[PDB]
Amino acid sequence: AIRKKLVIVGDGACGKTCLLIVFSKDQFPEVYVPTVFENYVADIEVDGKQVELALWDTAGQEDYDRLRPLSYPDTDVILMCFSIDSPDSLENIPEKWTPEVKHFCPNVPIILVGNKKDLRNDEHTRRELAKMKQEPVKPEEGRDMANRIGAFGYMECSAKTKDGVREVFEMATRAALQ
C-alpha cells in the first residue's frame, strides 16, 4: 500500500466536513453529526491498487491566510468543493481558491466537487434562491467551471444520501496515483 494525501478546500458552508465524515464512517451519522473532522487514513483499493489515503479538512481556516497554507505540504490530490444550493460559492472558485491551490500545490490534480446535489430538487431551496434572482447550480455550470479552472474532472455528490460519495474518493485516489 502506497501513502497519498487528500485535502478538501472550499467555502465555509460548502459541506466539506459532512463529506469527510460520511466517507470515513461509511454512512450518514444517525444520532449526532460531528461539528469537526480531525483526520482519517482510509484503506482504499482502486483499479487493483491498494492505497492508504490520508484525509484532511480546511474547515475553520477560511479567514486565516497564514495558517491555512500549512494544510497544503505534500498534498497528492485536492477536492475543491462548492455547494449546489449556493451559486455564490461557485463564483469564489476561480479567483479565490484556484489561484491559492495552484500556488501552494503546483501540478496537483484538482477535482471540482458539487456537494448537496439533493437540494437541486428541494422546494425550500428553490424558493429561498428565487428571492435573490438565483437557482440551484446546473450540472453544465459545474462542468464549465471545472473546465475553465483546469480541473482533473467534475463530480457531484450528496453526503445526506451517500449518493456519489464512494465514487468521489475512488476517483481522487486514481488522480493521486497519476
Partner: protein, 242 residues
C-alpha cells in the same frame, strides 16, 4: 490517554454516553447542547493524546534509542512541552467540570450547565498570551519540522527503522510525525466552530449565552493574533531572503 477518560468518551455522542433512563428526563434542546459540549471535551482529550504521542513516543524515544543530537529532536517537535502543558491543564478543568456535574451513584450521567466562564478564563489573560506566543512559534516552525523529518527518514537507516517500529500498531494509523504536526496546527481553528455550535444551543440562560459570546470573541482575537505572528522559517535561510 487513561482508560477512565477513554471509556467516558468512547460513545459517539452525549446521548449515547449517558444512561437512556437519564437521557429521557431531559429536553431535546439540552441533549443538543450536551452533545456539542461532549464533542469539545472528547476532541480536547484526543488533542492532548496527540501531544503525548509526540513528547513520550516520538521525542523521548528518539533521545533514548537513537541518541540523536537534541537540537535535531527540537527542530522535529518545536514547543511540544509548552503545548502539552497548556492543553493538559485545559483538559483537566473540562474533566473536573464534568466530574462535579455527575449524579451521585453514577460515573456517566451528567449535565454541564456552565461552560462560558471556563472558556473566558482559558482564552483571556496570561493563559491566552501563552497560547498566542506558543502557536505563533509552533506554526512558524511547522514547515521546517516536516522538511527535517523527510531528510532523516530518507537518509538515516536507524531513524527509518525507529519510525517504522513505533508507528506499526494500528492505533497509530493516523498519528505519524507529519500527521501529529498538522493535527496540532489545525486544533486552534476548531475552537470557534465548536463554541459557535454550543452557543446556538445555549440561549436558555442569558448569562451563559453572554459568556459563550464573549469566549467566541476571545478565541477569534487569539486566532487573528496567531495568524499575524506567523512567518515560515526555512532551514539555512539567508538574511537577504528574510
Amino acid at each position: 490517554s487513561m482508560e477512565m477518560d477513554e471509556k467516558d468518551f468512547a460513545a459517539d455522542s452525549w446521548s449515547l454516553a449517558v444512561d437512556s433512563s437519564f437521557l429521557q428526563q431531559h429536553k431535546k434542546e439540552v441533549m443538543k447542547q450536551q452533545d456539542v459540549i461532549y464533542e469539545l471535551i472528547q476532541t480536547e482529550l484526543h488533542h492532548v493524546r496527540t501531544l503525548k504521542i509526540m513528547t513520550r513516543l516520538f521525542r523521548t524515544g528518539m533521545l533514548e534509542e537513537l541518541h540523536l543530537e537534541p537540537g535535531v529532536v527540537q527542530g522535529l517537535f518545536p514547543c511540544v512541552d509548552e503545548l502539552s502543558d497548556i492543553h493538559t491543564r485545559f483538559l483537566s478543568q473540562l474533566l473536573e467540570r464534568r466530574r462535579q456535574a455527575l449524579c451521585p451513584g453514577s460515573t456517566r450521567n451528567f449535565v454541564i450547565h456552565r461552560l462560558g466562564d471556563l472558556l473566558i478564563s482559558q482564552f483571556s489573560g496570561p493563559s491566552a498570551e501563552q497560547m498566542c506566543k506558543t502557536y505563533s512559534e509552533f506554526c512558524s516552525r511547522h514547515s521546517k519540522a516536516l522538511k527535517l523529518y523527510k531528510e532523516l527518514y530518507a537518509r538515516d537507516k536507524r531513524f527509518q527503522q525507529f519510525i517504522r517500529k513505533v508507528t506499526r500498531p494500528a492505533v497509530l494509523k493516523r498519528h505519524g510525525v507529519q500527521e501529529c504536526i498538522l493535527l496540532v496546527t489545525q486544533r486552534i481553528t476548531k475552537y470557534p466552530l465548536l463554541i459557535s455550535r454550543i452557543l446556538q444551543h445555549s440561549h436558555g440562560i442569558e448569562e451563559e449565552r453572554q459568556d459563550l459570546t464573549t469566549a467566541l470573541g476571545l478565541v477569534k482575537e487569539l486566532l487573528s493574533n496567531v495568524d499575524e505572528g506567523i512567518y515560515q522559517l526555512e532551514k539555512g535561510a539567508r538574511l537577504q531572503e528574510i
